[PDB]
């Protein structure tokens, strides 16, 4: 699991060493987040509002149909047995006609809303299946599709009529200011980082990664040359370490 | 004036504009960091270089053709301005939705003035004109007709509401992906890379 | 209605004047303007916290009839404050209410100005592992309605009368069956992504990560995890 | 007519509930589309974007 | 172009001299279909000299 978590860190652009230096911290943070979710589910109510809302909508539709079953619809009585036992075949036939028209209209209306709700639930289920496929069976690069931040993974759980996704994600924090430059001028040549960012703490220049502060000395291994210092806007003069001269000398 | 009212939206135009302005400011100043948490300042040239790296172009191309890229972007924005100012029917979807809702409302209003088999379509004439029994049966006919019309209007309104909800979900997905970050999906956020 | 002086010009042969909807607008010259009417809504914070409520008259300028005027109408019974808070009870047109009852303008969010400048960046030096709960409905309760029994209720004459009304009952039954099988298919496609039922190893050594609270528990309450048990106990059927 | 309609049934309540649900749905769509970010950002006074 | 072989990026024409730094070796050249003969620059020999 540590190697898988390191792979997922690589997915969000964070190297493995960041994880392996702070594996215990990451595990503790994950456990604390799980405990916080536990506490929220135990104490805070209405956390399953969508499922409660759809269940209440279905129950309200059923109750409305039941109540509408007890309507006169312009007839003498709302119950069919009394009309059958009280009226002659012609008048009883007319009353039954009125009652059937009313009840059929009500049933058609209920079926129409049931079909609309079924279409909405089908759309929601398709979204849930897409989330399960793209976040539980793999790492999703889509922004805010499976949580706020850089998505790491997701865990599925059942619910009486739904699915609960626990999205584990990476959030940057404890940010610091730095001075940057598009490229570095050395020996009349412009050097751009392979991957990362050029930063300065005030006196010295380093190269690191965008999503984490891991300063490293400027080297020809992590930089590439693509011309001179006359076209890049914002060039900054600095030396570039060559890890070959000390070995030769 | 016949029981039909238009409820004002909760979010007014000014607050929606403020949302869009805040999103644009976050995108220009930070790019995609503000969508994943706290906003992080970036000179927006290195952010554009990062986007070029994402699409598969090295940062040197942008750092050598920044002036050309900026000029092309400004020209494209000006072209969009000219198209929105001169060319009409550029907002056909919103106009179609508005006309659809207006046509539904007008159709309901016109249906409000139908005989439905009655002597007259004016209820007050029937009430001040006729004695309780057959006036009541005529009112019943009018009620059946008007209830049928209002029910079918509500049904089509629900269908259009479902369509609008699907469109809004698509728009929210686009805002989350195209605006708050860089999307690798082909043709999801415009033709090309 | 209300009789008003009319600026409209009527020809000598004209007696009534109708606007759109073919309804009477002017009568010989006086314009007919229906007197003030509209909807009435009640804003309450819940019977538990208090019994105080506010009354909202929408599309009505209640100067004719703690009064506050808004684009959504007018509110009575709630004080208007010049501050801004998160919207608790949405009234409309940017106006919300909360709990005495206070009516205010919804605050869009915290206002900050990022320190943008060239050759300057902000880089994080730490990380947070955040787990967010997201709930998606997968299916709803499957219901079947017997149209003949619902409409009639064990009556042969009603059944004969319904028989020659057409095959509406068959259409409704087919629609309900389609809805039920659609719910079943939705549940299957959501929860049957994998064709193999994998089992966790008896030893749980995941580098310090602890999943015993999301894995099935030894108590075996229908073989549901602790979080799943909480989720099931939170919804009342 | 009001007495006759209340004798007819209770369709009006269902219709009003459907309309209210549609309005709340529209408000939800607007909120989810436009209120994704919880913090309002202001562009700096200096317009230096390269 | 007509005679000389370079290595570039997929979405832009930025030719560069073929070098062991931007190329990787995997097996012999008797299996790859369509391989061509060309020299590969080693940026260590001039440094030694
Ligand atoms: C910047 O970092 C270098 C090495 O990490 C250190 O020698 C120097 O004192 C630092 N300067 C400031 C201003 O922090
Ligand atoms: C930053 O902007 C200032 C003035 O706006 C300019 O003098 C300076 O050269 C710029 N630096 C970079 C790296 O763009
Ligand atoms: C960088 O160095 C070159 C030559 O060493 C010089 O011409 C140029 O002015 C320098 N630039 C700065 C900003 O010091
Ligand atoms: C009001 O809600 C609180 C929730 O903390 C509950 O403890 C209390 O019993 C409720 N009061 C009534 C009268 O229901
Ligand atoms: C309500 O009427 C008053 C005077 O009758 C007027 O000043 C006010 O502007 C009206 N309200 C609106 C929203 O126009
Ligand atoms: C405080 O709110 C009231 C609204 O009742 C407003 O009239 C007044 O101007 C506000 N005070 C300010 C903005 O200083
Ligand atoms: C440094 O960063 C903080 C936020 O991290 C920002 O408010 C400030 O303007 C930056 N610049 C300084 C302190 O010079
Ligand atoms: C990062 O934050 C954690 C707490 O979340 C803290 O224990 C750790 O020391 C921090 N690391 C740094 C380098 O500030
Ligand atoms: C996981 O957490 C639970 C409760 O927090 C604890 O009882 C259990 O021992 C933990 N597992 C491990 C391996 O620490
Ligand atoms: C191909 O490019 C190389 C290097 O630019 C040049 O020496 C050579 O003459 C070119 N050949 C042709 C046919 O253009
Ligand atoms: C391409 O096809 C031709 C035959 O049309 C063949 O002679 C040549 O060797 C092929 N080259 C490659 C690289 O496949
Ligand atoms: C490449 O060179 C080898 C020996 O140096 C030779 O056997 C082979 O035929 C050459 N390739 C071609 C396409 O001629």
Numbering used by the authors:
A (entry chain C): 898 to 1146
B (entry chain A): 855 to 1047
C (entry chain C): 550 to 577, 584 to 620, 641 to 674, 691 to 828
D (entry chain A): 749 to 798
E (entry chain A): 1098 to 1146
Excerpt from the paper describing this PDB structure:
Host cell entry is orchestrated by the viral spike protein that, upon binding to ACE2, mediates fusion of the viral membrane with the host membrane. The ectodomain of the heavily glycosylated spike protein forms a trimer where each protomer consists of a core S2 subunit and a distal S1 subunit. Each S1 subunit comprises a receptor-binding domain (RBD) that can switch between an exposed “up” conformation and a “down” conformation, where the latter is inaccessible for ACE2 binding. In particular, sybody 23 (Sb23) binds to recombinant RBD as well as to the prefusion spike glycoprotein with high affinity and shows very potent neutralization activity.
To understand how Sb23 neutralizes SARS-CoV-2, we determined the cryo-EM structure of spike bound to Sb23. Lastly, a cryo-EM structure of Sb23 bound to the spike reveals that Sb23 binds in the ACE2-binding site on the RBD in both its “up” and “down” conformation and thereby effectively blocks ACE2 binding. In the pool of particles that enabled a high-resolution reconstruction, approximately half of the particles had one RBD “up” (1-up) and the other half a conformation with two RBDs “up” (2-up). A cryo-EM reconstruction of the spike revealed that Sb23 bound two conformations of the spike, one “1-up” and one “2-up” conformation. In both main conformations and for both “up” and “down” spike protomers, Sb23 binds in the inner edge of the ACE2 interaction interface of the RBD thereby effectively hindering ACE2 binding. Modeling the ACE2-spike interaction based on the ACE2-RBD crystal structure (6LZG31) of the soluble part of ACE2 bound to SARS-CoV-2 RBD shows that Sb23 hinders binding of ACE2 in both the “1-up” and the “2-up” conformation. Interestingly, ACE2 binding to the “up” protomer is hindered in the “1-up” conformation also from Sb23 binding the neighboring “down” protomer. Hence, even if the blockage of ACE2 binding in the “1-up” conformation from two independent sites may contribute significantly to the efficacy in neutralization by Sb23, the interprotomer-medicated blockage is reduced in the “2-up” conformation.
